Amino acid sequence: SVFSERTEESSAVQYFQFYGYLSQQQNMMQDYVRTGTYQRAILQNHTDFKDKIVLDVGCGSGILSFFAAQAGARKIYAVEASTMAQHAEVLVKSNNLTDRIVVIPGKVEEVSLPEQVDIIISEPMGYMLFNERMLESYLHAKKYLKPSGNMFPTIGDVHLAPFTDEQLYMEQFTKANFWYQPSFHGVDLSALRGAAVDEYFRQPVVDTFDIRILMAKSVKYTVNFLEAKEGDLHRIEIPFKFHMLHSGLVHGLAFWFDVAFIGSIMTVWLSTAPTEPLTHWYQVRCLFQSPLFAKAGDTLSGTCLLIANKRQSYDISIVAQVDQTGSKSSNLLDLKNPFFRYT
Amino acid sequence: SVFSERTEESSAVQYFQFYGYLSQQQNMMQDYVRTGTYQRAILQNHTDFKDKIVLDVGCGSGILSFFAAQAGARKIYAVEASTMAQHAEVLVKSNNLTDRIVVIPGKVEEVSLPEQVDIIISEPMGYMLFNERMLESYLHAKKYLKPSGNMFPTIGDVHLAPFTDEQLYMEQFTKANFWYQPSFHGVDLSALRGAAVDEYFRQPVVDTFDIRILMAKSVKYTVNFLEAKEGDLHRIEIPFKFHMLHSGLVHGLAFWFDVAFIGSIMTVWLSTAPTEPLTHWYQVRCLFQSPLFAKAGDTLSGTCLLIANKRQSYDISIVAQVDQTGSKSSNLLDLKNPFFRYT
Amino acid sequence: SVFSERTEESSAVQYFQFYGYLSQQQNMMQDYVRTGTYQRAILQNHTDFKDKIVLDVGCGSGILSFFAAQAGARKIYAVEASTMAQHAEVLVKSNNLTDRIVVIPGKVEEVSLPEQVDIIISEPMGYMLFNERMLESYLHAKKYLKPSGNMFPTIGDVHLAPFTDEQLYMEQFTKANFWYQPSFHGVDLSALRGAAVDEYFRQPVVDTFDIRILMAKSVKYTVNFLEAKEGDLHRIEIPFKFHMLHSGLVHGLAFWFDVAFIGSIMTVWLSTAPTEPLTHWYQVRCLFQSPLFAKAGDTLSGTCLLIANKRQSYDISIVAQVDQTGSKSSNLLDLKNPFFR
Amino acid sequence: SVFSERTEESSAVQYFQFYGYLSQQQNMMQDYVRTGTYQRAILQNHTDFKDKIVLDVGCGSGILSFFAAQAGARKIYAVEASTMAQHAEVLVKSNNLTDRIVVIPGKVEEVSLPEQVDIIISEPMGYMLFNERMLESYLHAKKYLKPSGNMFPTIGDVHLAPFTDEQLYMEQFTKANFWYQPSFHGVDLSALRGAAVDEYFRQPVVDTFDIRILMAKSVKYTVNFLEAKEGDLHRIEIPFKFHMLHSGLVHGLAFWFDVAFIGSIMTVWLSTAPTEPLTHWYQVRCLFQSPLFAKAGDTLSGTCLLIANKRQSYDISIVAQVDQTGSKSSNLLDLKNPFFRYT
Ligand SMILES: Nc1ncnc2c1ncn2[C@@H]1O[C@H](C[N+]2(CC[C@H](N)C(=O)O)CC2)[C@@H](O)[C@H]1O
Ligand SMILES: Nc1ncnc2c1ncn2[C@@H]1O[C@H](C[N+]2(CC[C@H](N)C(=O)O)CC2)[C@@H](O)[C@H]1O
Ligand SMILES: Nc1ncnc2c1ncn2[C@@H]1O[C@H](C[N+]2(CC[C@H](N)C(=O)O)CC2)[C@@H](O)[C@H]1O
Ligand SMILES: Nc1ncnc2c1ncn2[C@@H]1O[C@H](C[N+]2(CC[C@H](N)C(=O)O)CC2)[C@@H](O)[C@H]1O
């Protein structure tokens, strides 16, 4: 299967074991912004669902499928690969919807659907949108979508912006400098200080922040789920040219994302921006190894390259330079092992 | 391999990836009770090391091997399966001990050692002592131990005692009760409430507590690492009979452990008891889905059965009853997936 | 009789035996807010009583009739069905008011009065205003009221508002969870857990609380005693639409009531609101078996249906929903069996 | 029926409505002394139940029948008049004992049993033992008992003792004196003060107390349930002659009770005495209208006459005198309407 080919089995096992827990499903369900916005997007665009055939990619508890049912869908195929699939089946029965919702256990890349569908619904977004690589399953599912069929969400925007946060930056060295002591219980640890610094900076930082740390208007990279192919997500190149609104040291790039449900009646947005109420996605920050000084009016140019790996995540390569000075910075990050800083 | 035969590859990959991070080694190293007590046990029993051959099972950063070197060991074989092995080699060189500490990368079940050893050192204790199943590697390593050889630690004591803690119980039940809702966004979840209660209560609670919640003197189960065979740890049956010192609700059983380094000069104890300074092991509590009411003077009898599984952990079954009334409670816990309440 | 037809004898016996005790009359009389406010309402509107004919429905000790006498009433018919009537007569004589207060023993639905009256006075309010169904006797008594006659109290307002109180909810759930035990002295009780939850949550909680638990402005349901007919109280439908002021868990609805004495000189209010001094009515809360999550700005809509029963109380049906999400709750409560917290 | 003839319908309605509540059954069940002692009495006398035919009079939740089942009873007829009978039936089914326990809805005076029984079990005790008059149903049930059959409980002892409690005595007047004011909101209430006093003194006081208020060894009146006829409980004349252990003012009589289960293996006692842990029966105190002064060594003699009424309770007539002085006091109380004083 397309899934097995791009995924190490260990990662897959861990991944689907994770979503097999009712507590995790609960965690997602209790994100009111997320769940409420999905429900609103579906119900307020009822003409896109009334008497239509729906596919729910990775249904988990089945919540989105129930929303599709509330909107008057004729038939909903709810595909789920973790053991949660059996819990979803229990809920379909207890909610007396066996005639409209059909739970299909397995990976969307591997199962068979009896018919083509009018619309695909899913919640495949991870940290900085792409983590977990579930968007590829979402796009893969379009083999079951009728021509002129729709996708909910329809588009996803990843936003990047430079930030300044001296304390976050210094924190890394504060932690790494544990190893910079010549006699920890008689042992000289200093030779590993460099490796410890490297390790900490390889971790994207998951948490939220004050919008005032942002130093320029965000650059946006858009994925149109109606048009995109799975292969499009294997290598994501995000060029950027920031026009600095404030002077100071740029310690790295902040990441967040929006998705839009573009229905026949209206477009509904779900945003994880730092200007919006917090979600379980928080925001993500990737530090530069060396901060870059910029003046208001300077331009900070470069590239963020996301390379998919078989651990259902991305290797992140960020290169940035201040055009006016030529001062340059690079970093390589492992999105699979983020540092959850939020407290 | 003995290791591969008892371990799902997924679990192993995850497991050794975890210990490959310097931050984790740092976390363990910064547990001063742990590190200081190991150093004390080794240095105060220096005659057990001076001019001896040592095996360090799962050396991590290599700290224990350095303690063995400080104690005058002639040769130390430091076996480590994670990539941390590469970092240990760096420290051996930067500390000018290349003539004495020899890092051997690989599983202790799989590597080859040049000679038999006088003493095995290791830190194989997990939560509730047995978590991670690393004790089996430790015991397995005894194939390299001389007949008159020693083990550091030499023995392990698991302590269990009944506790009362209304707040914790209600804390978990509150979480479980999410699945009691008959109309979550219009969806009836209640059919899954039982499954949800089971899941949350399968989680051992890792944290510390006031000793006054304990309702009876602890029961002790001892493993002698010098005598035990790894096969002995596949099924661990711990019967208990508590003489209740206080009347009230028994919400579950609390667990901690001690290990002893029985050297020629002195015996040194490392304790994780709640009467002792806190360690990174904290303590572990297994909750009952329904508490058992007992009066002072009653006897609380039963069994704690640990069945090893392929995820490097144990399936825990606890059956307890108040003998005077026949009030019985049975419980299943998944030691691999605990709830870290300390945060 | 209208009373007997709507009342089981067991309930009636118990009810009037209850009010036959001097300790109970004492308990009510010592509610100073109540007694003082009634006295204030009557005396400050003395012109509505001066040389007037009065009917006191359910006079108990006779206190309100004495207030009517103080205000200058010419003659007061004080009707009382319990044995307390004999004690009231003792007080009428010991206070030398035999020429002005006339105790009529019996139920107001059954006795005969010599003449029509200018004004009816009564204290017929129970928990949630309607408990005990004495308002129906009060309204029934209007057959003795002259046209354009007055009633003290004149109107009653029932207030309802959503509240959050996790502690109360868990307090009740904890009690219910006794029946969750799989081995109580070796016996599995779990099969009855559902029935136990239903029973406990069927109990309205009588007590007071901090106003900060209230999550929206109260909704008001008004009964005009001058216009209402007793039949109006057999089935009381109270629709509601709350505009949520705070985000959180709605554990149920809180209930209280006000009554107003609309006299010629001034309008006097007697309130049991949690913003006001405590009375023996306290306040009443109806819990949901499962709380409803709401955000500030959401609307919580539904209906409270009160159906009178033959035990001189009400069967309560509460249906509520968060309009934005469709989260719905239905509950059935037995006002006859409240929990005094 | 015998029940209807001795009971006002209103009282019966209220009575069985009361026990129809799970909360009340629970209230009784949660009395650990009561329930635990019944269980102990039944299980420790297992030879009295093993392969026997049992009758449970007023089974309520059915708890005692399950205890009879634990003891090995062959068949248990569980009679219950309230709607609780249906809840008991649910538990019989859920505990897989339909082959051994037969729930019979209705009054034991009115239902038909197919067979004679070896032993009757019941918990028919009220305040002062006799309140609620359920002992008469218990004795009435012996028409179904084999000649060589047993009763559990086998005997009941009601204890009476003189007490001194100045504050309790004064309390009555403190409350009654509410009516002794000439202008309560302008009203002279004084004319009702006497009636208020009378009312308060007619109420037995239900609560507990310090045993030091007791001025003499209790007098005991024993009912042997194996020998007694229900008619014996219509008029209970309890003569007493107390040998005063302390000097002082006697304000009234305190009441409590014991029952004994006289089995083949052992006799088990259930006590509600103030020297024992508190039960849901508390204790009962009946005041004298006027206190009696007594010296240590004096004898306090008289009679407590309990006259059964149609409200499933008793009118209590107490006459007492100090023999040495001839000082006499009496009271008449209505046990149907006690004052619950406990705090
Ligand atoms: N390839 C796949 N085939 C089938 N199911 C898949 C696949 N990849 C992930 N999933 C599942 O989708 C789920 C992703 N999610 C959504 C849960 C639910 N729709 C909600 O919105 O609450 C939890 C976030 C998660 O349960 C995964 O197990
Ligand atoms: N079968 C195995 N073969 C070789 N190494 C193994 C095996 N199982 C676990 N390990 C490793 O031991 C280590 C266990 N520990 C000890 C670290 C060090 N000794 C200290 O005290 O600081 C971190 C706690 C951990 O690094 C594991 O990777
Ligand atoms: N249908 C009826 N006919 C005559 N009397 C009735 C009827 N229903 C209730 N009552 C009686 O009114 C009384 C109600 N109350 C009022 C006492 C007095 N007015 C005060 O405010 O202090 C005590 C509260 C109570 O004694 C009942 O017995
Ligand atoms: N004449 C009668 N026939 C049948 N049942 C009767 C009769 N009189 C009372 N009862 C019932 O006995 C019960 C008395 N009790 C016992 C409950 C249970 N056996 C226990 O020990 O927990 C609650 C205390 C109560 O439920 C009454 O409804």
Query: What is the 3-class SS of A180-202, one letter each residue?
Result: CCCCECCECCHHHHHHHHHHHHC
Tell which residue, C184, C132, C186, has the closest CA to residue C309. C132
| Residue positions counted in chain A | 343
**Domain final residue pick, A104, A125, A153:** A153
> Cα–Cα distance between B59 and A326 in angstroms, integer?
45
**What is the DSSP annotation of C168-229?**
HHHHHHHHHGGGG-S-BTTB--GGGHHHHHHHHHTSPEEE---GGGB-SPPEEEEEETTT--
Tell which residue, D56, D142, D140, has the closest CA to residue D102. D56
Is the Cβ–Cβ distance between A298 and A322 less than 8 Å?
yes
How much distance in Å is there from the Cα of A36 to the middle of ligand 1? 17
How much distance in Å is there from the Cα of B122 to the middle of ligand 2? 8
Q: Do residues B144 and B160 share a domain?
A: no
> Cα–Cα distance between B60 and C14 in angstroms, integer?
80
Is the Cβ–Cβ distance between C204 and C128 less than 8 Å?
yes
The residue assigned the tokens 């350095």 is: B66
Measured at the CA of C301, the angle between CA C297 and CA C305, to 5 degrees, comes to 150
**What is the DSSP annotation of C257-313?**
EEEEEE-SS-EEEEE--TTS---TT-EEEEEEEEEEEE-TT-EEEEEEEEEE-TTSS
- How many CB atoms are closer than 10 A to CB A251? 26
Q: Do residues D63 and D209 share a domain?
A: no
Residue A129 identity (one-letter amino acid): L
- End-to-end, the C-alpha distance of chain D in Å comes to 40
Residue C112 buriedness (CB in 10 A; 0-12 / 13-18 / 19+): exposed
**Closest Cα in chain B to C322:** B185
> Cα–Cα distance between B137 and B19 in angstroms, integer?
16
| Residue bearing the CA closest to ligand 4, atom 2 | D107
Region of residue D253 (phi > 0: left; psi between -120 and 50: alpha; otherwise: beta): beta
> Cα–Cα distance between A193 and B61 in angstroms, integer?
13
> Cα–Cα distance between D335 and D204 in angstroms, integer?
6
Residue B5 phi/psi, 5° resolution?
A: -65, -30
Catalytic residue (one of A123, A136, A157, A165)? A123
β-bridge partners, B160? B219, B255
Atom from ligand 4 closest to the CA of residue D79: 4
Does the annotation place C109 within a ligand binding site?
A: yes
C31 labelled catalytic: yes
Pocket flag, ligand 4, residue D134 (CB < 6 Å): yes
Whether omega before A153 lies within 30 degrees of 0, making that bond cis, reads yes
| Residue bearing the CA closest to ligand 1, atom 1 | A107
> Cα–Cα distance between D285 and D208 in angstroms, integer?
9
The two tokens of residue D19 are: 């026990």
Is the Cβ–Cβ distance between C300 and C322 less than 8 Å?
yes
Burial C299-308 (b: 16+ CB within 10 A, else e): ebebebbbeb
3-state class (DSSP) for residue B295: coil
D210 labelled catalytic: no
- Chain centroid to CA B11: how far? 17
How much distance in Å is there from the Cα of B89 to the middle of ligand 2? 15
Decide if B186 and C329 are in contact by the 8 Å CB cutoff: no
Contacts of B103 (CB under 8 A, 6+ apart): B59, B62, B78, B80, B85, B88, B89, B92
Q: Do residues D116 and D170 share a domain?
A: no
Pocket flag, ligand 4, residue D71 (CB < 6 Å): no
- How many CB atoms are closer than 10 A to CB C273? 16
* D35 interaction partners in chain C (CB closer than 8 Å): 185
Q: Which residues line ligand 1 (CB under 6 A)?
A: A 3, 16, 19, 28-29, 58-61, 63-64, 79-82, 84, 107-109, 123, 134, 137
Q: Walk across the sheet containing A53-57 and list its strands.
A: A101-105, A75-80, A53-57, A117-122, A145-152
Smallest CA–CA separation between A31 and chain B, in Å? 12
β-bridge partners, B293? B249
Q: Are strands B267-271 and B248-262 parallel, antiparallel or unpaired?
A: antiparallel
The two tokens of residue D6 are: 């001795």
Burial A124-163 (b: 16+ CB within 10 A, else e): bbbbbbbbbbbbbbbbbbbebbeeebbbbbbbbbbbbbbb
Q: How far is CA B19 from CA B1, B58, B63, C221, in A?
A: 21, 10, 14, 66
* B196 interaction partners in chain A (CB closer than 8 Å): 22, 26
For chain D, give the residues followed by a break (C–N over 2.5 Å): none
**Domain final residue pick, B153, B168, B201:** B153
**What is the DSSP annotation of A96-124?**
T-TTTEEEEES-TTT---SS-EEEEEE--
Atom from ligand 4 closest to the CA of residue D16: 28
Q: How far is CA A246 from CA A251, C227, D323, D333, in A?
A: 13, 71, 105, 90
Q: Do residues D275 and D180 share a domain?
A: yes
- How many CB atoms are closer than 10 A to CB B75? 19
> Cα–Cα distance between A91 and A105 in angstroms, integer?
14
- How many CB atoms are closer than 10 A to CB B266? 11
The two tokens of residue B70 are: 């400080």
Range A265-268 contact pairs with CB under 8 angstroms and sequence separation of 24 or more: A265/A44, A265/A45, A265/A46, A265/A47, A265/A48, A266/A44, A266/A45, A268/A37, A268/A40, A268/A41, A268/A44, A268/A45
Residue A51 identity (one-letter amino acid): D
Interface test with A, best of C325, C327, C328 (most A CBs within 10 A): C325
Residue C188 phi/psi, 5° resolution?
A: -85, 110
> Cα–Cα distance between A201 and A195 in angstroms, integer?
10
Tell which residue, C98, C101, C103, has the closest CA to residue C83. C103
| Residue bearing the CA closest to ligand 2, atom 10 | B58
How much distance in Å is there from the Cα of C79 to the middle of ligand 3? 8
- Name the residue facing A187 among B21, B95, B175 (closest C-beta): B95
> Cα–Cα distance between D114 and D140 in angstroms, integer?
16
Pocket flag, ligand 4, residue D88 (CB < 6 Å): no
Please report which residue ranges of C45-179 form alpha helices under DSSP H: 63-70, 84-94, 134-140, 166-176
- How many CB atoms are closer than 10 A to CB D83? 13
The two tokens of residue B274 are: 């709640």
Mutational pocket test of ligand 3: of C137, C151, C279, C312, the residue with most ligand atoms within 8 Å of the beta carbon: C137
* A30 interaction partners in chain B (CB closer than 8 Å): 178
Is the Cβ–Cβ distance between B130 and B306 less than 8 Å?
yes
Please report which residue ranges of chain B form alpha helices under DSSP H: 2-6, 9-19, 22-29, 32-44, 63-70, 84-94, 134-140, 166-176, 193-201
Residue D254 sits in a domain of what CATH number? Answer: 2.70.160.11
Q: Do residues A141 and A165 share a domain?
A: no
Q: Which residues line ligand 3 (CB under 6 A)?
A: C 3, 16, 19, 28-29, 58-61, 63-64, 79-82, 84, 107-109, 123, 134, 137
Please report which residue ranges of chain A form alpha helices under DSSP H: 2-6, 9-19, 22-29, 32-44, 63-70, 84-94, 134-140, 166-176, 193-201
- Chains in contact with B, where contact means 3 or more Cβ–Cβ distances below 8 Å, are A, C, D
Q: Do residues C181 and C315 share a domain?
A: yes
The two tokens of residue A4 are: 């097995």
- Chain centroid to CA C291: how far? 26
B·D CB contacts under 8 A: 8
Q: Kindly list the catalytic residues of B.
A: 31, 123, 132, 280
Residue B48 buriedness (CB in 10 A; 0-12 / 13-18 / 19+): buried
Q: How far is CA C70 from CA C50, C51, C206, in A?
A: 9, 11, 34
Q: Do residues B186 and B100 share a domain?
A: no
Q: What technique determined this structure?
A: X-ray
Atom from ligand 1 closest to the CA of residue A82: 28
Decide if B325 and D39 are in contact by the 8 Å CB cutoff: yes
Q: Which structural domain, as residue segments, surrounds residue A166?
A: 155-343
Nearest bound ligand to the CA of residue A83: 1
Residue A186 phi/psi, 5° resolution?
A: 90, 0
- Sign of the alpha-carbon dihedral angle for A197, A199, A204, A208: negative
- Name the residue facing C183 among B183, B184, B329 (closest C-beta): B329
How much distance in Å is there from the Cα of A205 to the middle of ligand 1? 24
Does the annotation place C30 within a ligand binding site?
A: no
- How many CB atoms are closer than 10 A to CB C219? 18
| Residue bearing the CA closest to ligand 3, atom 3 | C107
What resolution, expressed in A, was reported for this entry? 2.2
The two tokens of residue D297 are: 């060594």
Tell which residue, B11, B22, B311, has the closest CA to residue A11. B11
A84–chain B Cβ distance below 8 A for any pair: no
| Residue positions counted in chain D | 343
**Closest Cα in chain B to D39:** B325
The two tokens of residue A150 are: 């729709």
Q: Do residues B132 and B201 share a domain?
A: no
Decide if C184 and D29 are in contact by the 8 Å CB cutoff: yes
The two tokens of residue D206 are: 């239900």
Residue D235 buriedness (CB in 10 A; 0-12 / 13-18 / 19+): exposed
- Name the residue facing A39 among C293, C295, C325 (closest C-beta): C325
Decide if A93 and B179 are in contact by the 8 Å CB cutoff: no
A123 labelled catalytic: yes
Residue C316 buriedness (CB in 10 A; 0-12 / 13-18 / 19+): buried
Is the Cβ–Cβ distance between B61 and B80 less than 8 Å?
no
- How many CB atoms are closer than 10 A to CB B115? 11
Q: Do residues C111 and C181 share a domain?
A: no
Does the annotation place A126 within a ligand binding site?
A: no
Contacts of C6 (CB under 8 A, 6+ apart): C133, C136, C308, C310
Decide if C326 and B186 are in contact by the 8 Å CB cutoff: yes
**Closest Cα in chain D to C93:** D191
Decide if A36 and C325 are in contact by the 8 Å CB cutoff: yes
Q: Do residues C44 and C12 share a domain?
A: yes
D276–chain B Cβ distance below 8 A for any pair: no
- Sign of the alpha-carbon dihedral angle for D24, D25, D28, D30: negative
Contacts of B106 (CB under 8 A, 6+ apart): B79, B80, B81
- How many CB atoms are closer than 10 A to CB D323? 13
Whether omega before C105 lies within 30 degrees of 0, making that bond cis, reads no
> Cα–Cα distance between C321 and C328 in angstroms, integer?
4
3-state class (DSSP) for residue B149: strand
- End-to-end, the C-alpha distance of chain C in Å comes to 37
Helix axes A84-94, A22-29, angle to 10 degrees: 60
Residue D153 buriedness (CB in 10 A; 0-12 / 13-18 / 19+): buried
Run of H or E residues at C20 = none
- DSSP class of B246: S
> Cα–Cα distance between A250 and A285 in angstroms, integer?
12
Decide if A36 and C326 are in contact by the 8 Å CB cutoff: no
C295–chain A Cβ distance below 8 A for any pair: yes
Mutational pocket test of ligand 4: of D25, D37, D57, D138, the residue with most ligand atoms within 8 Å of the beta carbon: D57
Is the Cβ–Cβ distance between D124 and D132 less than 8 Å?
yes
Sheet strands (E) in chain D:
53-57, 75-80, 101-105, 117-122, 145-152, 155-163, 205-207, 219-224, 235-243, 248-262, 267-271, 283-294, 299-308, 314-322, 327-334, 339-340
Residue C77 sits in a domain of what CATH number? Answer: 3.40.50.150
> Cα–Cα distance between D228 and D233 in angstroms, integer?
9
Q: Do residues A149 and A167 share a domain?
A: no
Tell which residue, B315, B328, B310, B323, has the closest CA to residue B286. B315
Q: Do residues C136 and C172 share a domain?
A: no
B277–chain D Cβ distance below 8 A for any pair: no
Does the annotation place A80 within a ligand binding site?
A: yes
**What is the DSSP annotation of D48-106?**
GTTT-EEEEET-TTSHHHHHHHHTT-SEEEEEE-STHHHHHHHHHHHTT-TTTEEEEES
The residue assigned the tokens 């590190």 is: B35
Range C12-17 contact pairs with CB under 8 angstroms and sequence separation of 24 or more: C12/C312, C13/D10, C14/D10, C14/D14, C15/C132, C15/C312, C16/C81, C16/C82, C16/C83, C17/C82
Does the annotation place D34 within a ligand binding site?
A: yes
How much distance in Å is there from the Cα of C13 to the middle of ligand 4? 24
**Domain final residue pick, D119, D138, D153:** D153
Decide if C327 and B170 are in contact by the 8 Å CB cutoff: no
Contacts of A99 (CB under 8 A, 6+ apart): none
Run of H or E residues at D33 = helix D32-44
**Number of domains making up chain B:** 2
Residue D312 identity (one-letter amino acid): Q
Run of H or E residues at B179 = none
Tell which residue, B330, B331, B337, has the closest CA to residue B314. B337
